[PDB]
Amino acid sequence: KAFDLVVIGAGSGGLEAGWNAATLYGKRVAVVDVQTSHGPPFYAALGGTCVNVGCVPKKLMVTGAQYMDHLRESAGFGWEFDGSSVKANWKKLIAAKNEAVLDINKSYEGMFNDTEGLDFFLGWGSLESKNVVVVRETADPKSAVKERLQADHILLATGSWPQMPAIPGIEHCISSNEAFYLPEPPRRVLTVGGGFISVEFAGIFNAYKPPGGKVTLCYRNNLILRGFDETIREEVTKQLTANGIEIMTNENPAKVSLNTDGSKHVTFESGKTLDVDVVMMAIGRIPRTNDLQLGNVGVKLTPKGGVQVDEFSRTNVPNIYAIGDITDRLMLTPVAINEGAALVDTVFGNKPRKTDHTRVASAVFSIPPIGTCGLIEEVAAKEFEKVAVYMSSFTPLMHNISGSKYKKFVAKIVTNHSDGTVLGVHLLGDGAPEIIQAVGVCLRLNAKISDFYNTIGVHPTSAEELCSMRTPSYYYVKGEKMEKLPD
Amino acid sequence: GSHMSKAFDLVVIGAGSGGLEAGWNAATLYGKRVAVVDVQTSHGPPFYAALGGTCVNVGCVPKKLMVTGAQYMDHLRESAGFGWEFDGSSVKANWKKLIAAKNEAVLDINKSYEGMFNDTEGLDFFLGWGSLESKNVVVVRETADPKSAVKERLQADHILLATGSWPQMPAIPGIEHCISSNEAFYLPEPPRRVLTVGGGFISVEFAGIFNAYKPPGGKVTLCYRNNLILRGFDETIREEVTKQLTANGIEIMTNENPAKVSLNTDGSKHVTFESGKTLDVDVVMMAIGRIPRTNDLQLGNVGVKLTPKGGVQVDEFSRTNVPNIYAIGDITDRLMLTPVAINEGAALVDTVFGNKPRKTDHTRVASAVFSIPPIGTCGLIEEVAAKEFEKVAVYMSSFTPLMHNISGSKYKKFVAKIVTNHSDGTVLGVHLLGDGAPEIIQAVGVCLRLNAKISDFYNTIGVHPTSAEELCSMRTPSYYYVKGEKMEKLP
Ligand SMILES: Cc1cc2nc3c(=O)[nH]c(=O)nc-3n(C[C@H](O)[C@H](O)[C@H](O)COP(=O)(O)OP(=O)(O)OC[C@H]3O[C@@H](n4cnc5c(N)ncnc54)[C@H](O)[C@@H]3O)c2cc1C
Ligand SMILES: Cc1cc2nc3c(=O)[nH]c(=O)nc-3n(C[C@H](O)[C@H](O)[C@H](O)COP(=O)(O)OP(=O)(O)OC[C@H]3O[C@@H](n4cnc5c(N)ncnc54)[C@H](O)[C@@H]3O)c2cc1C
Ligand SMILES: CC1=Nc2ccc(Cl)cc2[C@H](c2ccc(C)cc2)N1CCCN(C)C
Ligand SMILES: CC1=Nc2ccc(Cl)cc2[C@H](c2ccc(C)cc2)N1CCCN(C)C
Ligand SMILES: [Br-]
Ligand SMILES: [Br-]
Numbered sequence: 001k002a003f004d005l006v007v008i009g010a011g012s013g014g015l016e017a018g019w020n021a022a023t024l025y026g027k028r029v030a031v032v033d034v035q036t037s038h039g040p041p042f043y044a045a046l047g048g049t050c051v052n053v054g055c056v057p058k059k060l061m062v063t064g065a066q067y068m069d070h071l072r073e074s075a076g077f078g079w080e081f082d083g084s085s086v087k088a089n090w091k092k093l094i095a096a097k098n099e100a101v102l103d104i105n106k107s108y109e110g111m112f113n114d115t116e117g118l119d120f121f122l123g124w125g126s127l128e129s130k131n132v133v134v135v136r137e138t139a140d141p142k143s144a145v146k147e148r149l150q151a152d153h154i155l156l157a158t159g160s161w162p163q164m165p166a167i168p169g170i171e172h173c174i175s176s177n178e179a180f181y182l183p184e185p186p187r188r189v190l191t192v193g194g195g196f197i198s199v200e201f202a203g204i205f206n207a208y209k210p211p212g213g214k215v216t217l218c219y220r221n222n223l224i225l226r227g228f229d230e231t232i233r234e235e236v237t238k239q240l241t242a243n244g245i246e247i248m249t250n251e252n253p254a255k256v257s258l259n260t261d262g263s264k265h266v267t268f269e270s271g272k273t274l275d276v277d278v279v280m281m282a283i284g285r286i287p288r289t290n291d292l293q294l295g296n297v298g299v300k301l302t303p304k305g306g307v308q309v310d311e312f313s314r315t316n317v318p319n320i321y322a323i324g325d326i327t328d329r330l331m332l333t334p335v336a337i338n339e340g341a342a343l344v345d346t347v348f349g350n351k352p353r354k355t356d357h358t359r360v361a362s363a364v365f366s367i368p369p370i371g372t373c374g375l376i377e378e379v380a381a382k383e384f385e386k387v388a389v390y391m392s393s394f395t396p397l398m399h400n401i402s403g404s405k406y407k408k409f410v411a412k413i414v415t416n417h418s419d420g421t422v423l424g425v426h427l428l429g430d431g432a433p434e435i436i437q438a439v440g441v442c443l444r445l446n447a448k449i450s451d452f453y454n455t456i457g458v459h460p461t462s463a464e465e466l467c468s469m470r471t472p473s474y475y476y477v478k479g480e481k482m483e484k485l486p487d
Numbered sequence: 488g489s490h491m492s493k494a495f496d497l498v499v500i501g502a503g504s505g506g507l508e509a510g511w512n513a514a515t516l517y518g519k520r521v522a523v524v525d526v527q528t529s530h531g532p533p534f535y536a537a538l539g540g541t542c543v544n545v546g547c548v549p550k551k552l553m554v555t556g557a558q559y560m561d562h563l564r565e566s567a568g569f570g571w572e573f574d575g576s577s578v579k580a581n582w583k584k585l586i587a588a589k590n591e592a593v594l595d596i597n598k599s600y601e602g603m604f605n606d607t608e609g610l611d612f613f614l615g616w617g618s619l620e621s622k623n624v625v626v627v628r629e630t631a632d633p634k635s636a637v638k639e640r641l642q643a644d645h646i647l648l649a650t651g652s653w654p655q656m657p658a659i660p661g662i663e664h665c666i667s668s669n670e671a672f673y674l675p676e677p678p679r680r681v682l683t684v685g686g687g688f689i690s691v692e693f694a695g696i697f698n699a700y701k702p703p704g705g706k707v708t709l710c711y712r713n714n715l716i717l718r719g720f721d722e723t724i725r726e727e728v729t730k731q732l733t734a735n736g737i738e739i740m741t742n743e744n745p746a747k748v749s750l751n752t753d754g755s756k757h758v759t760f761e762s763g764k765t766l767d768v769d770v771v772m773m774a775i776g777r778i779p780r781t782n783d784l785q786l787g788n789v790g791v792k793l794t795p796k797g798g799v800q801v802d803e804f805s806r807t808n809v810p811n812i813y814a815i816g817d818i819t820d821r822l823m824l825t826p827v828a829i830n831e832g833a834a835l836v837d838t839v840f841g842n843k844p845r846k847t848d849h850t851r852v853a854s855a856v857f858s859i860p861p862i863g864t865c866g867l868i869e870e871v872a873a874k875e876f877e878k879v880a881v882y883m884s885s886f887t888p889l890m891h892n893i894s895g896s897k898y899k900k901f902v903a904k905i906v907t908n909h910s911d912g913t914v915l916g917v918h919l920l921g922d923g924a925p926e927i928i929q930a931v932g933v934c935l936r937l938n939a940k941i942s943d944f945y946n947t948i949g950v951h952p953t954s955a956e957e958l959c960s961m962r963t964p965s966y967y968y969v970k971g972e973k974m975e976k977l978p
């Protein structure tokens with residue numbers, strides 16, 4: 001049939017837009033995805049990347065990995081139990097995660113089936129013409145058409161996909177996709193990449209690895225988590241090392257060979273070599289545009305392969321929109337959901353709305369985790385004459401007792417020292433992702449450092465640290481780091 | 488001949504949250520000469536509080552350490568949903584190790600504060616009992632008995648009363664067989680059966696502590712003379728906390744109040760309630776309230792007025808009716824929180840010795856209850872708001888988070904409620920129940936001070952997946968109050 005809206009990708013942005021157009025605006029909506037539930041072959045499915053092979057299962061898996069620390073840290077508080085009897089049962093973790101995600105998948109299929117004007121189609125969506133979306137049996141554009149759907153408006157929301165550098169032996173590497181489904185936890189694992197997916201998985205593998213296992217994270221440059229606070233980048237490196245992960249910086253895989261026993265022989269540019277059981281590539285994610293046959297309608301793509309869009313998510317083709325990771329901007333679920341919601345409000349509501357991509361709070365579920373919102377100081381120092389940095393870094397007391405003395409909580413506030421405006425807030429330590437959330441609200445309210453400092457703390461918490469800092473630890477004046485102001 | 492009393496700009500009586508903040512600030516920021524008096528240099532019996540105050544010694548610090556210990560009961564159990572396997576029959580909660588570790592941690596804090604006296608010019612510690620001999624004289628005596636030997640007589644230009652509060656022990660037959668939180672911190676063994684009397688945070692929190700470390704066959708019961716524990720808190724939370732305590736094995740006796748306590752021949756306590764009901768327990772912990780500790784200060788020597796409920800009466804700037812005599816923290820019987828005593832102390836010193844007169848804002852103070860799971864709260868509860876504003880909106884989110892479907896603790900509903908003035912969207916109160924509530928709430932305190940509106944919460948992009956993001960995905964009230972009266976839709 002014909003629809004007010006055809007959504008290609010039943011994911012975070014897609015389902016927001018679909019649901020809202022159907023239920024808030026009474027529109028006739030079609031949503032297409034390649035799989036109704038999670039896992040191989042296509043990994044992402046109804047619900048999106050986040051639901052199936054993204055935020056949801058990884059958070060459960062990190063939650064899982066945290067018990068490594070919990071069991072050990074209990075002793076400090078008088079918990080006694082046979083430490084030798086402890087086993088991290090990965091099969092059980094994945095089965096529980098699988099079931100949890102399947103319930104979300106099922107619960108998305110229910111909502112299609114219960115909601116009028118919102119119909120879901122199985123298969124591969126592509127652009128046949130301006131107002132025509134074809135549904136094929138496979139990603140092969142030569143595969144059998146299942147449906148041809150006329151659409152007043154077409155939304156592209158196909159997310160992203162692991163980027164696999166074209167080094168020899170790349171086919172012996174897995175991405176995050178396959179990591180969610182490993183039948184056994186790897187004894188030795190290389191995670192390639194210094195970004196959050198590699199860091200998060202290195203923490204998960206570290207907790208579930210068999211006896212004598214080793215997790216190694218490698219990263220091509222000097223310091224992992226580029227784009228994050230630098231004190232936090234250094235400190236999380238120390239804390240991952242402290243919990244037995246090897247971080248190989250300035251290293252990059254040049255070749256992966258398959259050993260006959262199924263293990264991988266990794267050769268680095270340096271000529272260094274490492275043998276692991278699993279090489280997980282987590283060096284980036286790229287917009288998922290190949291399969292859309294955008295050539296058919298001339299929808300422009302940026303150098304990076306992302307669908308170009310303006311602030312209202314319009315592509316160059318009128319009635320054709322793109323939101324979410326396909327647009328290659330901020331790759332976060334709540335950003336994609338917001339874009340989706342705003343798009344529907346502009347196309348079917350009376351008031352345009354554009355997503356604000358600044359001051360977005362985000363988290364790394366590393367162990368220990370990171371919460372951050374707004375500018376890191378080096379970016380701050382480039383756009384503001386006077387930047388002040390308030391920093392606190394204390395091993396919390398519970399951790400002196402737990403035995404995890406390396407677990408410093410880091411709290412940094414970055415300000416425009418000229419007016420006191422908070423430019424960004426950066427945290428490392430348990431609760432960092434929870435803490436940062438309302439920080440994000442504060443920045444929308446042009447919070448100044450005196451607003452944080454004059455708020456009464458909640459005690460005892462790590463969070464109160466943010467309401468306890470009134471003197472900068474150091475400044476940037478004209479891009480220049482210095483402990484004191486000049487004059 | 489005669490010789491000179493040690494003289495100070497400021498004498499602080501009570502080396503606690505409030506006193507130390509004031510003491511330190513007057514000395515290190517305004518170069519004042521500051522005496523601080525407390526009755527013990529380190530934690531524990533006989534006087535329990537000590538250098539560092541209630542918080543350090545027998546309050547926030549040791550209780551948080553103990554709640555953290557208590558949380559492992561839940562972690563060890565919940566770990567199994569995530570594939571952790573171990574021999575659950577080898578599991579034992581060793582209370583003595585908990586308390587020994589907690590004692591070491593508190594002792595390092597005590598030592599650390601003593602070093603800080605030792606190292607800081609113009610900031611002097613005096614061990615003993617502080618009382619007001621006259622308007623500008625603080626005497627320090629050997630014991631709380633106003634007839635014990637005067638150890639030191641201090642000349643003081645300004646006197647800060649910062650003696651905190653103390654547990655209220657109801658005048659019942661056999662009160663002497665009961666304890667307070669003070670003693671809970673030093674019990675040589677974990678009680679097998681305990682009654683925590685009180686519906687407020689300290690009873691709720693210690694109920695969870697006792698519950699986690701109690702020996703085999705133990706039972707923790709909490710009683711409260713009223714209908715619903717945690718008066719002052721959001722009602723959905725109060726009822727959820729009650730359910731989640733029960734789910735965790737704590738017996739909640741509401742509408743019950745002890746009338747007397749007798750010692751059984753085996754040394755256990757036989758509690759009879761007003762209603763005739765009875766309970767035997769090993770420990771009865773009274774946590775029905777804390778009262779301002781005004782009794783030993785001999786305030787009648789200088790005529791410092793008490794409120795009819797017994798705090799030192801102060802104005803917004805912490806002044807008593809007596810010039811140069813001030814009072815901050817629990818002695819004023821306002822909000823009994825550490826960061827508030829601290830805020831009062833700094834604001835007092837700024838006003839008296841700095842050039843920055845300032846008063847504490849006692850509204851929109853975030854606070855926490857370390858139940859398991861905890862409560863994080865800031866600002867007005869809806870029933871209070873409804874009395875002050877014509878249109879109140881309530882936005883509420885509730886649900887067992889996913890991790891807890893997998894962990895198995897499905898009773899563990901996260902509750903998030905935002906209370907607004909519906910006439911301009913201004914957030915009046917935010918109320919959280921669930922893991923990390925205390926951490927979440929802190930920046931929410933900053934939001935309230937910036938007069939955030941629900942539209943600012945809603946406009947903010949969620950951090951995913953967190954519990955906190957619930958606060959930024961609520962756009963439509965669950966219900967309203969329209970002049971006092973609840974309804975799901977406006978008229
Ligand atoms: C391992 C990992 C961890 C992550 N963690 C977080 C996190 O903690 N927090 C956070 O905010 N973000 C996280 N992300 C990012 C988040 O998953 C994405 O930002 C988000 O899912 C993007 O939503 P989307 O709507 O752009 O696309 P998606 O949610 O990816 O949806 C794309 C959908 O389109 C479907 N599709 C693709 N091609 C076609 C086709 N041609 N026809 C029909 N259907 C098609 C796919 O099957 C998929 O279901 C994580 C990502 C990964 C990979
Ligand atoms: C079990 C428990 C748990 C608590 N948990 C928290 C929590 O999690 N968060 C929070 O914010 N608050 C908590 N509180 C409250 C917090 O401890 C108090 O609000 C705060 O300590 C009050 O500060 P203060 O300066 O008024 O007094 P205090 O810190 O109590 O200090 C008063 C000091 O005066 C000394 N003193 C008393 N009389 C004399 C005398 N005549 N001469 C010399 N010295 C004297 C005492 O020995 C004491 O050290 C808790 C309290 C209790 C009892
Ligand atoms: C508003 C909304 N937004 C979404 C954004 C991203 C994802 Cl991955 C999912 C949603 C869900 C949702 C649920 C079912 C359908 C068919 C579409 C969207 N959804 C519906 C919310 C369910 N509600 C009853 C509590
Ligand atoms: C500013 C301040 N406020 C307090 C409020 C309540 C308490 Cl319990 C403690 C403090 C501490 C403190 C510690 C020791 C002394 C002698 C004074 C103040 N304190 C000083 C902290 C020292 N700082 C340099 C790490
Ligand atoms: Br009571
Ligand atoms: Br009541």
Ligand SMILES: [Cl-]
Binds near residue numbers: 088091092184
């Ligand atoms: Cl396994």
Ligand SMILES: [Cl-]
Binds near residue numbers: 192283
């Ligand atoms: Cl890399």
